[PDB]
Amino acid sequence: QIQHIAIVGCVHGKYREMYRQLSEYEKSTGKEISFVICTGDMQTLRYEADLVYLKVPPKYKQMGDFHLYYEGKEKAPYLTLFIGGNHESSNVLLHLYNGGFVCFNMYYLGVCSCININGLRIVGVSGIYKSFDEKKPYTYPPSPNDVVSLFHTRNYVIQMLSNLSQSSQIDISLSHDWPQGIVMKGNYKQLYRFQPGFKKDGASLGSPINKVILNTLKPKYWISGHMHCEYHAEEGPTHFIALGKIGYKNAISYLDLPLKQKTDLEYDKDWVCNLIMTWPAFSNKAQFPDLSYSISELLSKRTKELDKKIIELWEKYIGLKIIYDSDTFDIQFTSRRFYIEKIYNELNI
């Protein structure tokens, strides 16, 4: 048993092109794709109004193909899991900061999370790194002036993800910009003559946040995009792979991983437990996280008995399976934290 997983770099609204290339792989090679993985820049703009939240150079203020899938005119032939990049409809992703389906077969992993599928555990870290925004909170509802800062990776995702490898391995981890320093653990001199601009950042190229997460969880694979080029590197037990932009040859690659059993997309129990126990830091819907709280301190109260009950209550109110929901995203925002708060308060701490 083998499962073929498509890994995609920057999509930037070229969905019909991506699915055209994916469908030819299934027939040129005869292998079947289990699901698709995207490293960001999805541009999930539902309508013209969402263009205000797309931080791009003037030439790329374009709707893309997403609205056709959002409208139902097009249908994603494969289940597509993605994170956010630096060219996004950032308002939509903030509504879904705890993940959610933007349309059929297209699931956003949120600001960060861990999911389960086909016996694998997949971690996603959205955004790119900017030091001046790494401590800023999110303000809700989204405002057009936040178009420049909403896609910047926040420091707190480090504390939210660091313990996810304690009970079991992490198979795949997703980020947009590369983990800082990973440029040096491959054939960097070959890369420096195809990408001359990479020479001056040296080992500082990439996100320190994604660097910390990689060293803590050491997943089997770490996949990134952002840089619009192909690259491989090894950092201890972790295989790093970088992908390019849709429209070039370097956009899509394929992972052939062992398949124990076929399983629907499900929430990760350890992630769900971190999401419930960190609720007091997210209790203010207008501004979160409230970093007066220590995220690690809230998570140090996790117990096996409390974890068993959180998943019991999560299964009751939401379900272990991640299912499609077609409510508007602002309603999905309120709904998911309604049940996070309900599960947390039902524990009585």
Swiss-Prot record:
Binds 2 divalent metal cations per subunit. This is Lariat debranching enzyme. Keywords: Cytoplasm, Hydrolase, Iron, Manganese, Metal-binding, mRNA processing, RNA-binding, Zinc. The gene is DBR1. A divalent metal cation 1 binds at residues 10, 12, 228. A divalent metal cation 2 binds at residues 41, 86, 176, 226. It is found in: Cytoplasm, Perinuclear region. Belongs to the lariat debranching enzyme family. Its cofactor is Fe(2+); Zn(2+); Mn(2+). Active in presence of diverse metals including Fe(2+), Zn(2+) and Mn(2+). Binds two metal cations in two adjacent alpha and beta metal-binding pockets. The activity is the highest with Fe(2+) bound to the 2 metal-binding sites. The activity is slightly lower with Fe(2+) bound to the beta site and Zn(2+) to the alpha site and decreases further when only Zn(2+) is bound. No activity with Mn(2+). However, another study showed activity with Mn(2+) bound to the beta site and Zn(2+) to the alpha site. Mn(2+) appears unable to bind to the alpha site. GO terms for biological process: mRNA splicing, via spliceosome; RNA splicing, via transesterification reactions. Residues 126-154 are annotated as: Lariat recognition loop. Pfam families: Dbr1_C, Metallophos. Its EC number is 3.1.4.-. GO terms for cellular component: nucleus; perinuclear region of cytoplasm. One of its GO terms (molecular function) is zinc ion binding. Cleaves the 2'-5' phosphodiester linkage at the branch point of excised lariat intron RNA and converts them into linear molecules that can be subsequently degraded, thereby facilitating ribonucleotide turnover. RNA binds at residues 55, 86-87, 130, 152, 197, 201, 226-228.
